[PDB]
Subunit: 65 residues, 8 copies
Amino acid sequence: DTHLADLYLLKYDTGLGVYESFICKYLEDSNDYIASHPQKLSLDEMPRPLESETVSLRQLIVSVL
Amino acid sequence: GQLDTHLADLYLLKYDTGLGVYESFICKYLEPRPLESETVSLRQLIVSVLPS
Amino acid sequence: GQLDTHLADLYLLKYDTGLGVYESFICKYLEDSNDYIASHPQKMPRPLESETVSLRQLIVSVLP
Amino acid sequence: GQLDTHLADLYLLKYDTGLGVYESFICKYLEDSNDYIEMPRPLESETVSLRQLIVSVLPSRP
Amino acid sequence: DTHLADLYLLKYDTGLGVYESFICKYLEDSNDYIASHPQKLSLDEMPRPLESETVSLRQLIVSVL
Amino acid sequence: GQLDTHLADLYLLKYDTGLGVYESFICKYLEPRPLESETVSLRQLIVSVLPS
Amino acid sequence: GQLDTHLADLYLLKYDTGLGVYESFICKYLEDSNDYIEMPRPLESETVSLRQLIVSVLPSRP
Amino acid sequence: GQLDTHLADLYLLKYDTGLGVYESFICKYLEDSNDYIASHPQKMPRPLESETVSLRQLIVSVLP
Protein backbone atom coordinates (compact mmCIF):
# COMPACT_ATOMS: atom_id res chain seq x y z
CA ASP A 1 0.00 0.00 0.00
CA THR A 2 2.10 2.83 -1.40
CA HIS A 3 2.68 6.00 0.64
CA LEU A 4 1.77 9.17 -1.27
CA ALA A 5 1.97 12.13 1.19
CA ASP A 6 1.98 13.12 4.83
CA LEU A 7 -0.43 15.49 6.55
CA TYR A 8 -0.23 16.87 10.06
CA LEU A 9 -2.88 17.55 12.70
CA LEU A 10 -1.67 20.57 14.55
CA LYS A 11 -3.22 21.82 17.77
CA TYR A 12 -2.03 24.68 19.97
CA ASP A 13 -3.19 26.58 23.05
CA THR A 14 -3.77 30.24 22.20
CA GLY A 15 -3.29 31.70 25.71
CA LEU A 16 -6.90 32.80 25.89
CA GLY A 17 -8.61 29.57 27.06
CA VAL A 18 -9.11 27.96 23.71
CA TYR A 19 -7.00 25.70 21.48
CA GLU A 20 -6.95 25.88 17.68
CA SER A 21 -6.83 22.90 15.37
CA PHE A 22 -5.70 22.64 11.77
CA ILE A 23 -5.14 19.87 9.21
CA CYS A 24 -1.92 20.75 7.45
CA LYS A 25 0.48 20.04 4.60
CA TYR A 26 4.07 20.73 5.54
CA LEU A 27 5.85 23.02 3.16
CA GLU A 28 8.94 21.12 2.15
CA ASP A 29 10.70 18.86 -0.20
CA SER A 30 11.17 19.12 -3.90
CA ASN A 31 14.61 17.92 -2.69
CA ASP A 32 13.54 15.89 0.41
CA TYR A 33 17.18 15.64 1.61
CA ILE A 34 18.20 14.05 4.97
CA ALA A 35 17.82 16.64 7.74
CA SER A 36 20.07 17.55 10.65
CA HIS A 37 20.25 20.07 13.48
CA PRO A 38 20.03 23.66 12.20
CA GLN A 39 22.25 24.92 15.13
CA LYS A 40 24.75 22.11 15.70
CA LEU A 41 27.50 20.49 13.68
CA SER A 42 26.24 16.90 14.26
CA LEU A 43 24.89 15.01 11.27
CA ASP A 44 22.53 13.13 13.54
CA GLU A 45 19.18 12.96 11.85
CA MET A 46 16.57 15.47 12.95
CA PRO A 47 13.49 14.80 10.81
CA ARG A 48 11.34 17.73 9.65
CA PRO A 49 9.05 19.27 10.58
CA LEU A 50 10.74 19.91 13.85
CA GLU A 51 8.31 19.95 16.75
CA SER A 52 7.61 22.81 19.13
CA GLU A 53 6.90 22.54 22.82
CA THR A 54 3.83 24.71 22.30
CA VAL A 55 2.32 22.92 19.29
CA SER A 56 0.92 19.35 19.31
CA LEU A 57 1.62 17.56 16.00
CA ARG A 58 0.39 14.19 14.91
CA GLN A 59 1.33 12.79 11.49
CA LEU A 60 -1.07 11.15 9.10
CA ILE A 61 -0.24 9.33 6.02
CA VAL A 62 -2.08 9.33 2.68
CA SER A 63 -1.72 6.18 0.61
CA VAL A 64 -3.34 4.62 -2.38
CA LEU A 65 -5.97 1.97 -2.01
CA GLY B 1 -21.96 27.24 -2.00
CA GLN B 2 -20.07 24.02 -1.29
CA LEU B 3 -17.15 25.19 -3.42
CA ASP B 4 -17.02 28.38 -1.37
CA THR B 5 -16.91 26.41 1.88
CA HIS B 6 -14.18 24.09 0.61
CA LEU B 7 -12.03 27.08 -0.41
CA ALA B 8 -12.63 28.83 2.91
CA ASP B 9 -10.66 28.75 6.15
CA LEU B 10 -7.32 28.10 4.53
CA TYR B 11 -4.13 29.41 6.21
CA LEU B 12 -0.40 29.59 5.99
CA LEU B 13 0.71 28.62 9.47
CA LYS B 14 4.23 29.22 10.69
CA TYR B 15 5.63 28.24 14.09
CA ASP B 16 8.78 28.82 16.07
CA THR B 17 10.51 25.51 16.70
CA GLY B 18 12.67 26.89 19.55
CA LEU B 19 15.69 25.77 17.49
CA GLY B 20 16.12 29.05 15.60
CA VAL B 21 14.00 28.05 12.61
CA TYR B 22 10.33 28.31 11.73
CA GLU B 23 8.20 25.51 10.25
CA SER B 24 5.51 26.42 7.75
CA PHE B 25 2.34 24.63 6.59
CA ILE B 26 -0.63 25.11 4.30
CA CYS B 27 -3.68 24.29 6.35
CA LYS B 28 -7.42 24.03 6.81
CA TYR B 29 -8.67 25.45 10.04
CA LEU B 30 -10.95 22.99 11.80
CA GLU B 31 -13.65 25.46 12.88
CA PRO B 32 -11.79 36.66 15.50
CA ARG B 33 -10.74 33.01 15.06
CA PRO B 34 -8.33 31.32 14.55
CA LEU B 35 -6.14 33.10 17.11
CA GLU B 36 -2.37 33.22 16.95
CA SER B 37 -0.16 32.38 19.90
CA GLU B 38 3.29 33.70 20.86
CA THR B 39 5.00 31.10 18.69
CA VAL B 40 2.35 30.51 15.94
CA SER B 41 1.66 33.00 13.20
CA LEU B 42 -1.15 32.88 10.64
CA ARG B 43 -1.77 34.27 7.20
CA GLN B 44 -5.12 33.86 5.44
CA LEU B 45 -5.15 32.27 1.97
CA ILE B 46 -7.71 33.42 -0.51
CA VAL B 47 -8.68 31.40 -3.55
CA SER B 48 -9.89 32.99 -6.77
CA VAL B 49 -11.46 30.75 -9.44
CA LEU B 50 -10.46 32.05 -12.78
CA PRO B 51 -13.54 32.02 -15.05
CA SER B 52 -13.62 29.85 -18.18
CA GLY C 1 -15.02 22.10 10.39
CA GLN C 2 -14.10 18.55 11.59
CA LEU C 3 -11.47 16.05 10.45
CA ASP C 4 -13.58 13.39 8.73
CA THR C 5 -15.40 15.82 6.39
CA HIS C 6 -12.19 17.46 5.14
CA LEU C 7 -10.30 14.18 4.64
CA ALA C 8 -13.06 12.08 3.09
CA ASP C 9 -13.31 11.34 -0.64
CA LEU C 10 -9.70 11.89 -1.69
CA TYR C 11 -8.70 10.49 -5.07
CA LEU C 12 -6.08 10.07 -7.68
CA LEU C 13 -7.68 10.99 -11.00
CA LYS C 14 -6.35 10.30 -14.52
CA TYR C 15 -7.95 11.08 -17.86
CA ASP C 16 -7.38 10.67 -21.56
CA THR C 17 -6.91 14.04 -23.21
CA GLY C 18 -7.71 12.45 -26.62
CA LEU C 19 -4.40 13.90 -27.84
CA GLY C 20 -2.01 11.06 -26.97
CA VAL C 21 -1.29 11.88 -23.33
CA TYR C 22 -3.11 11.35 -19.97
CA GLU C 23 -3.43 13.94 -17.23
CA SER C 24 -3.20 13.02 -13.56
CA PHE C 25 -4.28 14.88 -10.44
CA ILE C 26 -4.56 14.35 -6.73
CA CYS C 27 -8.01 15.51 -5.70
CA LYS C 28 -10.80 16.08 -3.20
CA TYR C 29 -14.27 15.14 -4.53
CA LEU C 30 -17.03 17.72 -4.15
CA GLU C 31 -20.04 15.71 -3.11
CA ASP C 32 -23.27 16.93 -4.75
CA SER C 33 -25.75 18.35 -2.14
CA ASN C 34 -28.73 16.62 -3.79
CA ASP C 35 -28.81 13.30 -5.59
CA TYR C 36 -29.43 13.93 -9.34
CA ILE C 37 -31.43 10.63 -9.53
CA ALA C 38 -33.31 11.26 -6.23
CA SER C 39 -36.61 11.50 -8.09
CA HIS C 40 -35.93 9.38 -11.24
CA PRO C 41 -38.74 6.78 -11.71
CA GLN C 42 -36.09 4.00 -12.23
CA LYS C 43 -34.60 4.34 -8.68
CA MET C 44 -24.42 3.40 -8.15
CA PRO C 45 -21.56 4.74 -6.07
CA ARG C 46 -20.43 8.34 -6.47
CA PRO C 47 -18.10 9.63 -7.75
CA LEU C 48 -18.75 7.85 -11.05
CA GLU C 49 -15.87 7.27 -13.44
CA SER C 50 -16.31 7.73 -17.23
CA GLU C 51 -15.03 6.09 -20.37
CA THR C 52 -12.04 8.48 -20.34
CA VAL C 53 -11.56 9.14 -16.57
CA SER C 54 -10.27 6.67 -13.98
CA LEU C 55 -10.26 7.13 -10.21
CA ARG C 56 -8.36 5.51 -7.41
CA GLN C 57 -9.39 6.38 -3.87
CA LEU C 58 -6.86 7.37 -1.26
CA ILE C 59 -6.70 6.26 2.31
CA VAL C 60 -5.73 8.37 5.32
CA SER C 61 -4.30 6.68 8.33
CA VAL C 62 -2.26 7.48 11.42
CA LEU C 63 1.52 7.09 11.44
CA PRO C 64 1.87 3.67 13.27
CA GLY D 1 9.45 29.34 -3.14
CA GLN D 2 8.15 26.21 -1.43
CA LEU D 3 4.95 28.20 -1.08
CA ASP D 4 4.75 29.16 -4.74
CA THR D 5 5.39 25.57 -5.76
CA HIS D 6 2.67 24.25 -3.46
CA LEU D 7 0.14 26.86 -4.64
CA ALA D 8 0.88 26.23 -8.40
CA ASP D 9 -1.23 23.99 -10.64
CA LEU D 10 -4.34 23.89 -8.56
CA TYR D 11 -7.60 23.33 -10.49
CA LEU D 12 -11.32 22.91 -10.26
CA LEU D 13 -11.96 19.87 -12.51
CA LYS D 14 -15.31 18.84 -13.76
CA TYR D 15 -16.15 15.94 -16.03
CA ASP D 16 -19.11 14.42 -17.83
CA THR D 17 -19.70 10.91 -16.45
CA GLY D 18 -21.84 9.96 -19.49
CA LEU D 19 -24.66 9.12 -17.08
CA GLY D 20 -26.36 12.53 -16.92
CA VAL D 21 -24.29 14.07 -14.19
CA TYR D 22 -20.93 15.76 -13.95
CA GLU D 23 -18.49 15.14 -11.15
CA SER D 24 -16.42 18.00 -9.67
CA PHE D 25 -13.08 17.87 -7.81
CA ILE D 26 -10.64 20.34 -6.40
CA CYS D 27 -7.24 19.21 -7.54
CA LYS D 28 -3.54 19.49 -7.62
CA TYR D 29 -2.17 18.76 -11.12
CA LEU D 30 0.66 16.29 -11.26
CA GLU D 31 3.18 17.62 -13.79
CA ASP D 32 3.88 15.03 -16.48
CA SER D 33 7.57 14.12 -16.36
CA ASN D 34 7.44 11.55 -19.20
CA ASP D 35 9.91 12.12 -22.07
CA TYR D 36 7.68 11.03 -24.99
CA ILE D 37 9.31 9.50 -28.10
CA GLU D 38 5.29 19.15 -26.53
CA MET D 39 1.81 20.70 -25.99
CA PRO D 40 0.68 23.20 -23.24
CA ARG D 41 -0.55 21.55 -20.05
CA PRO D 42 -2.75 20.37 -18.49
CA LEU D 43 -5.02 19.81 -21.49
CA GLU D 44 -8.78 19.69 -21.27
CA SER D 45 -10.60 16.97 -23.14
CA GLU D 46 -14.09 16.78 -24.75
CA THR D 47 -15.54 15.68 -21.40
CA VAL D 48 -13.20 17.27 -18.79
CA SER D 49 -13.12 20.97 -18.16
CA LEU D 50 -10.58 22.82 -15.93
CA ARG D 51 -10.64 26.14 -14.08
CA GLN D 52 -7.51 27.46 -12.40
CA LEU D 53 -7.59 28.03 -8.65
CA ILE D 54 -5.36 31.04 -7.93
CA VAL D 55 -4.21 31.48 -4.35
CA SER D 56 -3.14 34.79 -2.79
CA VAL D 57 -1.64 35.22 0.66
CA LEU D 58 -2.75 38.03 2.97
CA PRO D 59 -0.26 39.82 5.09
CA SER D 60 0.30 38.52 8.61
CA ARG D 61 -1.87 40.42 11.07
CA PRO D 62 -0.53 42.68 13.85
CA ASP E 1 19.09 2.87 8.53
CA THR E 2 17.65 5.74 6.52
CA HIS E 3 17.42 5.52 2.71
CA LEU E 4 19.04 8.49 0.96
CA ALA E 5 19.11 7.73 -2.82
CA ASP E 6 18.89 5.00 -5.43
CA LEU E 7 21.48 4.18 -8.07
CA TYR E 8 21.16 1.79 -10.97
CA LEU E 9 23.60 -0.65 -12.56
CA LEU E 10 22.75 -0.68 -16.20
CA LYS E 11 24.15 -3.18 -18.67
CA TYR E 12 23.25 -3.59 -22.34
CA ASP E 13 24.39 -5.60 -25.35
CA THR E 14 25.67 -3.29 -28.08
CA GLY E 15 25.10 -5.59 -31.07
CA LEU E 16 28.80 -5.86 -31.76
CA GLY E 17 29.80 -8.65 -29.32
CA VAL E 18 30.36 -6.55 -26.27
CA TYR E 19 28.14 -5.28 -23.44
CA GLU E 20 28.50 -1.88 -21.79
CA SER E 21 28.12 -1.21 -18.10
CA PHE E 22 27.33 2.00 -16.26
CA ILE E 23 26.57 3.07 -12.68
CA CYS E 24 23.75 5.55 -12.93
CA LYS E 25 21.57 8.13 -11.20
CA TYR E 26 18.06 8.24 -12.62
CA LEU E 27 16.96 11.66 -13.65
CA GLU E 28 13.71 12.20 -11.83
CA ASP E 29 11.84 13.51 -8.92
CA SER E 30 11.80 16.94 -7.42
CA ASN E 31 8.10 15.92 -7.31
CA ASP E 32 8.49 12.11 -6.91
CA TYR E 33 4.75 11.57 -7.64
CA ILE E 34 3.14 8.08 -7.95
CA ALA E 35 3.67 6.78 -11.51
CA SER E 36 1.32 5.04 -13.92
CA HIS E 37 1.29 3.77 -17.49
CA PRO E 38 2.25 6.49 -19.99
CA GLN E 39 -0.01 4.89 -22.71
CA LYS E 40 -3.00 3.53 -20.78
CA LEU E 41 -5.76 5.02 -18.69
CA SER E 42 -5.20 2.65 -15.71
CA LEU E 43 -3.89 4.17 -12.49
CA ASP E 44 -2.13 0.92 -11.69
CA GLU E 45 1.29 1.75 -10.39
CA MET E 46 4.17 1.49 -12.85
CA PRO E 47 7.29 2.52 -10.93
CA ARG E 48 10.01 4.51 -12.71
CA PRO E 49 12.42 4.01 -14.26
CA LEU E 50 10.54 1.74 -16.55
CA GLU E 51 12.64 -1.18 -17.72
CA SER E 52 13.57 -2.07 -21.29
CA GLU E 53 13.84 -5.53 -22.74
CA THR E 54 17.27 -4.61 -24.08
CA VAL E 55 18.75 -3.06 -20.92
CA SER E 56 19.52 -4.95 -17.68
CA LEU E 57 18.86 -2.77 -14.61
CA ARG E 58 19.61 -3.57 -11.01
CA GLN E 59 18.80 -1.07 -8.26
CA LEU E 60 21.11 -0.14 -5.44
CA ILE E 61 20.30 1.85 -2.46
CA VAL E 62 22.44 4.45 -0.67
CA SER E 63 21.77 4.88 3.03
CA VAL E 64 23.39 6.50 5.98
CA LEU E 65 25.48 4.51 8.39
CA GLY F 1 45.46 13.35 -12.03
CA GLN F 2 42.98 11.58 -9.75
CA LEU F 3 40.54 14.47 -10.06
CA ASP F 4 40.75 14.16 -13.83
CA THR F 5 39.97 10.45 -13.68
CA HIS F 6 37.03 10.95 -11.33
CA LEU F 7 35.53 13.58 -13.67
CA ALA F 8 36.09 11.39 -16.72
CA ASP F 9 33.81 8.85 -18.40
CA LEU F 10 30.59 10.55 -17.40
CA TYR F 11 27.52 10.22 -19.67
CA LEU F 12 23.92 11.13 -20.10
CA LEU F 13 22.31 7.84 -21.03
CA LYS F 14 18.83 7.65 -22.50
CA TYR F 15 16.95 4.48 -23.41
CA ASP F 16 13.76 3.55 -25.19
CA THR F 17 11.43 1.78 -22.78
CA GLY F 18 9.26 0.30 -25.56
CA LEU F 19 6.32 2.10 -23.91
CA GLY F 20 6.65 5.32 -25.91
CA VAL F 21 8.87 7.11 -23.40
CA TYR F 22 12.60 7.37 -22.83
CA GLU F 23 14.36 7.02 -19.46
CA SER F 24 17.40 9.15 -18.79
CA PHE F 25 20.32 8.80 -16.34
CA ILE F 26 23.55 10.52 -15.36
CA CYS F 27 26.19 7.83 -15.32
CA LYS F 28 29.76 6.67 -14.93
CA TYR F 29 30.90 4.30 -17.58
CA LEU F 30 32.53 1.24 -16.05
CA GLU F 31 35.50 0.97 -18.44
CA PRO F 32 35.32 4.13 -29.65
CA ARG F 33 33.70 3.03 -26.37
CA PRO F 34 31.10 3.11 -24.90
CA LEU F 35 29.00 2.06 -27.90
CA GLU F 36 25.34 2.90 -28.31
CA SER F 37 22.74 0.32 -29.21
CA GLU F 38 19.49 0.68 -31.17
CA THR F 39 17.59 1.67 -28.05
CA VAL F 40 20.36 3.35 -25.94
CA SER F 41 21.74 6.76 -26.73
CA LEU F 42 24.74 8.46 -25.12
CA ARG F 43 25.94 11.99 -24.62
CA GLN F 44 29.32 12.76 -23.08
CA LEU F 45 29.44 15.06 -20.04
CA ILE F 46 32.40 17.31 -19.59
CA VAL F 47 33.31 18.87 -16.28
CA SER F 48 35.10 22.21 -16.00
CA VAL F 49 36.53 23.24 -12.61
CA LEU F 50 36.11 26.92 -12.24
CA PRO F 51 39.36 28.36 -10.82
CA SER F 52 39.38 30.08 -7.42
CA GLY G 1 15.15 20.67 -16.53
CA GLN G 2 15.72 17.51 -14.48
CA LEU G 3 19.15 17.58 -16.05
CA ASP G 4 19.89 21.18 -15.12
CA THR G 5 18.76 20.54 -11.57
CA HIS G 6 20.96 17.46 -11.24
CA LEU G 7 24.00 19.25 -12.69
CA ALA G 8 23.56 22.37 -10.42
CA ASP G 9 25.47 22.93 -7.18
CA LEU G 10 28.29 20.54 -7.77
CA TYR G 11 31.59 21.41 -6.03
CA LEU G 12 35.14 20.39 -5.39
CA LEU G 13 35.47 20.85 -1.59
CA LYS G 14 38.71 20.89 0.24
CA TYR G 15 39.27 21.40 3.94
CA ASP G 16 42.09 21.77 6.43
CA THR G 17 41.93 18.86 8.89
CA GLY G 18 44.18 20.71 11.39
CA LEU G 19 46.55 17.74 11.26
CA GLY G 20 48.78 18.87 8.39
CA VAL G 21 46.74 17.55 5.53
CA TYR G 22 43.71 18.69 3.59
CA GLU G 23 40.92 16.38 2.54
CA SER G 24 39.24 16.75 -0.87
CA PHE G 25 35.75 15.64 -1.99
CA ILE G 26 33.64 15.96 -5.06
CA CYS G 27 30.23 17.01 -3.88
CA LYS G 28 26.66 17.84 -4.46
CA TYR G 29 25.55 20.80 -2.30
CA LEU G 30 22.37 20.27 -0.36
CA GLU G 31 20.38 23.52 -0.57
CA ASP G 32 19.53 24.79 2.90
CA SER G 33 15.74 24.90 3.27
CA ASN G 34 15.72 26.18 6.88
CA ASP G 35 13.70 29.36 7.50
CA TYR G 36 16.00 31.03 10.08
CA ILE G 37 14.45 33.33 12.73
CA GLU G 38 19.88 35.69 3.98
CA MET G 39 23.50 35.34 2.72
CA PRO G 40 24.75 33.89 -0.66
CA ARG G 41 25.35 30.14 -0.62
CA PRO G 42 27.15 27.86 -0.12
CA LEU G 43 29.58 29.83 2.04
CA GLU G 44 33.22 28.95 2.42
CA SER G 45 34.73 29.03 5.88
CA GLU G 46 38.28 29.74 7.16
CA THR G 47 39.18 26.07 6.67
CA VAL G 48 36.88 24.92 3.80
CA SER G 49 37.37 26.08 0.26
CA LEU G 50 34.98 25.42 -2.68
CA ARG G 51 35.41 25.31 -6.45
CA GLN G 52 32.40 24.99 -8.72
CA LEU G 53 32.19 21.97 -11.01
CA ILE G 54 30.45 23.09 -14.21
CA VAL G 55 29.02 20.37 -16.42
CA SER G 56 28.39 20.71 -20.16
CA VAL G 57 26.63 18.15 -22.34
CA LEU G 58 27.97 17.23 -25.78
CA PRO G 59 25.61 16.63 -28.61
CA SER G 60 24.48 13.06 -29.22
CA ARG G 61 26.69 11.42 -31.83
CA PRO G 62 25.47 10.26 -35.26
CA GLY H 1 36.52 1.37 -14.18
CA GLN H 2 34.89 -1.14 -11.75
CA LEU H 3 32.00 -0.85 -9.29
CA ASP H 4 33.79 -0.93 -5.94
CA THR H 5 36.23 1.92 -6.76
CA HIS H 6 33.49 4.31 -7.91
CA LEU H 7 31.13 3.56 -5.00
CA ALA H 8 33.63 3.48 -2.15
CA ASP H 9 34.13 6.35 0.30
CA LEU H 10 30.79 8.13 -0.04
CA TYR H 11 29.92 10.61 2.70
CA LEU H 12 27.55 13.15 4.04
CA LEU H 13 29.61 16.20 4.99
CA LYS H 14 28.55 19.17 7.14
CA TYR H 15 30.59 22.17 8.22
CA ASP H 16 30.34 25.31 10.28
CA THR H 17 30.62 28.37 8.09
CA GLY H 18 31.49 30.48 11.19
CA LEU H 19 28.61 32.77 10.17
CA GLY H 20 25.70 31.12 11.99
CA VAL H 21 24.76 28.45 9.46
CA TYR H 22 26.11 24.96 8.50
CA GLU H 23 26.59 23.71 4.96
CA SER H 24 25.83 20.12 3.99
CA PHE H 25 26.88 18.06 0.98
CA ILE H 26 26.69 14.53 -0.30
CA CYS H 27 30.16 13.58 -1.45
CA LYS H 28 32.74 11.19 -2.86
CA TYR H 29 36.11 11.32 -1.06
CA LEU H 30 39.22 11.70 -3.21
CA GLU H 31 41.72 9.36 -1.64
CA ASP H 32 45.26 10.80 -1.59
CA SER H 33 47.67 8.75 -3.82
CA ASN H 34 50.46 8.89 -1.22
CA ASP H 35 50.16 8.92 2.54
CA TYR H 36 51.26 12.37 3.85
CA ILE H 37 52.68 10.69 7.03
CA ALA H 38 54.28 7.78 5.08
CA SER H 39 57.76 8.95 6.11
CA HIS H 40 57.05 10.85 9.39
CA PRO H 41 59.40 9.58 12.17
CA GLN H 42 56.39 9.21 14.57
CA LYS H 43 54.62 6.52 12.43
CA MET H 44 44.43 7.37 11.96
CA PRO H 45 41.64 6.66 9.50
CA ARG H 46 41.19 8.85 6.43
CA PRO H 47 39.26 10.95 5.68
CA LEU H 48 39.93 12.91 8.88
CA GLU H 49 37.25 15.22 10.23
CA SER H 50 38.15 18.66 11.69
CA GLU H 51 36.93 20.87 14.49
CA THR H 52 34.41 22.44 12.09
CA VAL H 53 33.67 19.54 9.66
CA SER H 54 31.72 16.37 10.44
CA LEU H 55 31.40 13.29 8.24
CA ARG H 56 28.98 10.43 8.13
CA GLN H 57 29.78 7.57 5.78
CA LEU H 58 27.19 6.18 3.41
CA ILE H 59 26.49 2.58 2.65
CA VAL H 60 25.59 1.09 -0.73
CA SER H 61 23.59 -2.07 -0.84
CA VAL H 62 21.41 -4.05 -3.22
CA LEU H 63 17.64 -3.60 -3.28
CA PRO H 64 16.53 -6.70 -1.20
